[PDB]
Design an enzyme around this catalytic site. Structure first.
Site, PDB file in Angstrom:
ATOM      1  N   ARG B  46     -68.741   9.348  45.158  1.00  0.00           N
ATOM      2  CA  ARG B  46     -68.463   8.025  46.130  1.00  0.00           C
ATOM      3  C   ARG B  46     -69.853   7.212  46.506  1.00  0.00           C
ATOM      4  O   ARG B  46     -69.927   6.249  46.788  1.00  0.00           O
ATOM      5  CB  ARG B  46     -67.419   8.292  47.176  1.00  0.00           C
ATOM      6  CG  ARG B  46     -67.107   7.264  48.049  1.00  0.00           C
ATOM      7  CD  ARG B  46     -65.791   7.224  48.809  1.00  0.00           C
ATOM      8  NE  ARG B  46     -65.615   8.662  49.156  1.00  0.00           N
ATOM      9  CZ  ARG B  46     -66.047   9.345  50.084  1.00  0.00           C
ATOM     10  NH1 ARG B  46     -66.987   8.641  50.904  1.00  0.00           N
ATOM     11  NH2 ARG B  46     -65.525  10.514  50.303  1.00  0.00           N
ATOM     12  N   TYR B  98     -60.799 -19.546  46.825  1.00  0.00           N
ATOM     13  CA  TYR B  98     -60.198 -18.566  46.282  1.00  0.00           C
ATOM     14  C   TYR B  98     -58.867 -17.997  47.114  1.00  0.00           C
ATOM     15  O   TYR B  98     -58.960 -17.690  48.196  1.00  0.00           O
ATOM     16  CB  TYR B  98     -60.708 -17.440  45.584  1.00  0.00           C
ATOM     17  CG  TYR B  98     -60.065 -16.464  44.582  1.00  0.00           C
ATOM     18  CD1 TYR B  98     -59.596 -16.970  43.471  1.00  0.00           C
ATOM     19  CD2 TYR B  98     -59.900 -15.315  45.195  1.00  0.00           C
ATOM     20  CE1 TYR B  98     -58.869 -16.074  42.808  1.00  0.00           C
ATOM     21  CE2 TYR B  98     -59.211 -14.303  44.244  1.00  0.00           C
ATOM     22  CZ  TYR B  98     -58.430 -14.633  43.347  1.00  0.00           C
ATOM     23  OH  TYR B  98     -58.076 -13.728  42.377  1.00  0.00           O
ATOM     24  N   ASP B 170     -69.960 -17.791  46.482  1.00  0.00           N
ATOM     25  CA  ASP B 170     -69.119 -17.278  45.766  1.00  0.00           C
ATOM     26  C   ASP B 170     -69.579 -17.815  44.134  1.00  0.00           C
ATOM     27  O   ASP B 170     -69.338 -18.938  43.992  1.00  0.00           O
ATOM     28  CB  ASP B 170     -67.599 -17.128  45.845  1.00  0.00           C
ATOM     29  CG  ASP B 170     -66.785 -16.652  44.713  1.00  0.00           C
ATOM     30  OD1 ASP B 170     -67.203 -16.323  43.463  1.00  0.00           O
ATOM     31  OD2 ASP B 170     -65.679 -16.387  45.090  1.00  0.00           O
ATOM     32  N   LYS B 195     -64.558 -11.460  35.739  1.00  0.00           N
ATOM     33  CA  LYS B 195     -64.463 -12.690  35.223  1.00  0.00           C
ATOM     34  C   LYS B 195     -65.676 -12.953  33.966  1.00  0.00           C
ATOM     35  O   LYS B 195     -65.570 -12.008  33.010  1.00  0.00           O
ATOM     36  CB  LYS B 195     -64.349 -13.895  35.944  1.00  0.00           C
ATOM     37  CG  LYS B 195     -63.713 -13.635  37.320  1.00  0.00           C
ATOM     38  CD  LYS B 195     -62.247 -14.109  36.785  1.00  0.00           C
ATOM     39  CE  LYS B 195     -61.729 -13.425  38.085  1.00  0.00           C
ATOM     40  NZ  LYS B 195     -61.360 -14.255  39.298  1.00  0.00           N
TER      41      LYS B 195
END
Lengths: 377, 362, 361, 368
Positions: B46, B98, B170, B195
């Site tokens: 992690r 968004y 973004d 994306k």
């Protein structure tokens, strides 16, 4: 995919939409076994697998062919095709074939297959070769490695079919982006999908693409019995790499052309071999059957020991294989053709200082600068 | 990768050598734990993972930045950055952000963060927006979704930095192929790597790219504690997709331009929204900060309810998301007029896509 | 899976049939996006994914619970549950929690959550602890790390519910093979599936298992907005490891008992902490709520610096984490000063006992 | 892994340290290509030839039989094909009559290459007759056999075969190295479909050969490289991951098989029950001498009507071919894979709860 052009088939060929959930990317079928009562086409993973079938449908579509079969490797695809030749029958190939193909030819000979090597670049070479009795298979690799000579597929296929022989083209070098052997008259396209088709140097695979239904049954029967099937995760990675095949190949070719001009301008470079050069001895054939001259270049280095040249590259990777996103460099005499004697290499026209480039998709100016730095002209 | 150009960095950035074996493609580090006596940087998956680090090194290099951090999703990257805003402080953002970002804004508001939406396309809008007291963060999405309006990153960053505020862009829509927010003056570039960066619609991921070392410590502290880390196989898929990012984006843009011309000639098309159109209301800014106008197009459909059009596509897929190799179409209102349609252009043959679009419209 | 016993549910829980092809192992759904006209529950991978849902169905089935939600890690599962506590409300926890949990408690505190650590092993500790006003959540880790203290879940849950608080049990150490917190009265079971559930030390994951439908809506809304979702390939690896969970845990426990006997016989070992020992201060509670005493052991090493002991192991691996097929050893203070923790794997018990004995020597 | 016991070798066999990072689970080597200048000792050239993830799996498998060599393949068939390719024209292969259908398929191919294939009964002092064959190159033993579960004395057949200079292979897929050790019994090669119990989770294809002869090693590796029947690295990772729990899974499967055999013996619609563990098994002495436990495969004669109807009634057992996996499977050889009656049923016992499996089996047998 009827009516769809090549670049569309790369993306949507074999893309079965998922009933119920509607996944755009088909899920990866890892299961080895199938419930019989839940269907009845799927019995066991060695015989049947939807992920594998989707990749085969895509590959077949790229050549507008009815059939494709994929394998654990390019070698496995070649072995499968060669297994259909009976003891007492003849395979005609050329001298300069891929070492693995020659390895398979040696195995076939030890089972009583006749392998005849020939010059398939001249009318007299072709006539002599195809005069062999019981001619079952003509094995064409074009362009060849590492001298990049080319064989006229349409012409050899015409003469071979007059003798009733099957014709295969190992189309690994060019890929279906640049060369379409079935459209040129061949019966089978053979691939190492390990190279440019998967394109990211992270999976092994092979493929046969063809149109004959009897051939299809024979090829599928051998694969099931020999068990040289690829895993589903491997098929997924090959299929995923395939999306960008035309993008990658077009960039690789453009950069190769730039590198060829750098090589021609270097005082420590002698002969430069590239299918696209106007003075290439088979330039008319290249223009007739390749839509672009490919991403492989070779040249004679004049500046000192080849091992030292290899040590000076900092962007090109020194290693074997080709077609991937990372540019590679090798010296056939030291690496791919090392098992041969110096006399065998001399007879094949492979000098000690012959260098081969496999052009990747890095920035062309970075690759040109690395090459110039290494050449140290 | 010093001196190497963008396309080279896509292939070799973070491509760490394998000592001994010499692997060209680095092996996938799936192990959750590490032998301590065999090293001392790696303790637990992690916190540390070589495959994840190699992806981060690649992304940071694409913007010539010192730091990047990847996440289980774009939302997780956004959540991480937003967690650094303290109660009593203010975030100012572009209005059309968004929906997920807005979802995060709602959560932040319930923690005592003041969230202000603003028009950042005008000098009056920006001045008004940046007058907020305790301004901590200016959240810019450009081009915006789905109208593809554009915000001047350099100008907003100048004004925001006068107020001491952090600026994030973004940059999911444009990708680092087309727009370089850190070079424009922003402090952070935010991505959904789901994306175009990963590009093949088969993995979720997020990323932050930035330069400040204090920010780096805070972002890594939150990711380790909140545990919004990506898996190694996912990082492998994102990194693999990244090799072809500039190839895919250049093709997607070329085809988008072809589709825009097809749209402009259709009698059942009204307004066409595309950063590359000369008459785009912010075209000067587009030219100044985007190297090409992108692969997203939107337009008003005049032929009736959007469902009438959507049902007719046979090559475009009707679904959400964007940036992938497969072309997508959606109606934002169903999935901003009721009949506004958004196209996400993939890498199919442009003539096939143009024919499918024309067929659907006719 | 109604009527099917636990070991069967491990294999067939969430094993949804493949229409048409009939795959016995469900295919791995990697797609981030879905065609809308081809269905309508699936829109986008962060929100919906069949491979993830299959793992969740399996996990819920192991506790006969209606709901489960999986996450990118155990920390993310914990963070999600903590996000439901409002500033001004109180969380009560055992004093001996996981360091990561303590990290999350610190984050929550900086948002105005009150965190109270308490002794939940005594009636007075429990009574004092649960007297906190605005008690929203009681956080039980049992057995605790690394001292293996045990908390009576049924008793604490009874008292906590009188105060209107939610009860979560971090059940990572025991796993659902050995302990069933929802059956004991807790509201939520929390897991790092990174540990014994996936079991092979090759994937990160977390899970929440619970029964409340309002909690379900809140948990899923947060996971979608925070985006702390696992990937499909990760869910596949967790699900694959899950098949052998009871086989692995039963072996690990059997071997742990052997190693405990070795430790207790060593002249360079002081306190030995193991829930199965008759002299464990909470043995009656262990017997009442654990079907077996687990595969984790800790002890005080008296033979010198912990590093010296750690360096001598040739089979145990010196590293953090637990629950996996590979046996692990660590010193919590480096990774009392001389406390050593063992996580027992599935190697041959005689090999592990010899390695431990050589090291202690 | 010297001195380590079997269950330890399952976990740590071939678990090569990662220099620098210290990964406990070795990373997955997917690269097909290798940089030549990056190797102090040049061992990795190309993925078909060399791969560290594949080699770690091979090292583990070899270790389970305390053998010097193992080679893995794209499938069990490919492993068998490789071994069979070494039999030359004019030479003879002697095999158990009831061999795996795929093995028979390979035998048919070999026969077309000038190999003589002879089937025999290797359960009786049948052996002498079989091994009297001229040019005997290979004796192919599958034990226990499918689907009647007869057993062949490996040590005895190996003794007689070696007098004739022949190589002995045991297809050890059914038993796995947990229950049977052909090399310790005198055989030259252990052959596996790792697709079955070794990987164990029905989600990857693979094969393996385990052996000791260095000349054989060179020939097997030369063939695998040239024929290209190599497994992918991700597949090797899944096989290796499954292998960790092999003895746990097998021991459970065997215990449950014993329970099901008792259930079968009590059924009025069951005739003969075939199981190596039964006291009245015709080769019971051999079973006790060479198998540490009698396995997880059971077959029986169903007397209750058409087999196709019986197969439809299972709700926990899955009707399908293959075996050895965590999911219990049922098939009727006459209807599916193939002294095999029309109503012979074969069970492959998985790791589900034994009482759930016994109830599903009883419910299916009873009908209604």
């Amino acid at each position: 995919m009827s009516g769809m052009r090549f670049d569309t088939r790369l993306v949507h060929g074999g893309r079965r939409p998922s009933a119920g959930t509607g996944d755009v990317v088909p899920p990866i079928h890892v299961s080895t076994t199938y419930e019989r009562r839940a269907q009845p086409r799927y019995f066991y993973g060695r015989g049947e697998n939807p992920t594998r079938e989707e990749l085969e449908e895509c590959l077949a579509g790229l050549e507008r062919a009815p059939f494709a079969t994929v394998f654990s490797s390019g070698q496995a695809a070649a072995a499968t095709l060669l297994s259909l030749v009976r003891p007492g029958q003849c395979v005609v190939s050329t001298d300069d074939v891929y070492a693995g193909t020659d390895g398979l030819f040696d195995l076939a000979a030890r089972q009583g297959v006749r392998v005849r090597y020939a010059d398939l670049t001249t009318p007299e070479g072709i006539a002599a070769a195809l005069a062999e009795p019981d001619l079952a298979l003509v094995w064409i690799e074009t362009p060849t490695n590492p001298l990049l000579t080319v064989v006229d597929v349409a012409e050899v296929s015409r003469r071979a079919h007059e003798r009733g022989a099957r014709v295969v083209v190992d189309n690994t070098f060019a890929s279906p982006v640049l060369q379409q052997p079935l459209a040129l008259g061949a019966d089978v396209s053979l691939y190492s999908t390990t190279k440019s088709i998967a394109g990211h140097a992270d999976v092994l695979g092979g493929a046969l693409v063809y149109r004959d239904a009897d051939l299809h049954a024979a090829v599928r029967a051998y694969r099931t019995t020999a068990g040289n099937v690829p895993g589903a995760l491997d098929c997924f990675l090959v299929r995923r790499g395939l999306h960008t095949l035309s993008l990658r190949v077009h960039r690789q070719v453009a950069t190769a052309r730039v590198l060829v001009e750098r090589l021609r301008a270097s005082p420590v470079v002698g002969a430069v071999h590239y299918p696209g050069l106007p003075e290439h001895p088979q330039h008319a054939v290249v223009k007739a059957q390749m839509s672009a001259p490919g991403a492989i270049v070779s040249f004679d280095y004049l500046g000192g020991p080849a091992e030292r040249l290899l040590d000076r590259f900092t962007l090109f990777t020194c290693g074997v294989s080709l077609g991937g996103v990372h540019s590679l460099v090798e010296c056939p005499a030291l690496m791919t053709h090392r098992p041969l004697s110096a006399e065998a290499r001399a007879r094949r026209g492979i000098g000690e200082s012959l260098i081969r480039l496999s052009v990747g998709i890095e920035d062309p100016q970075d690759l040109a600068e690395d090459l110039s730095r290494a050449l140290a002209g």
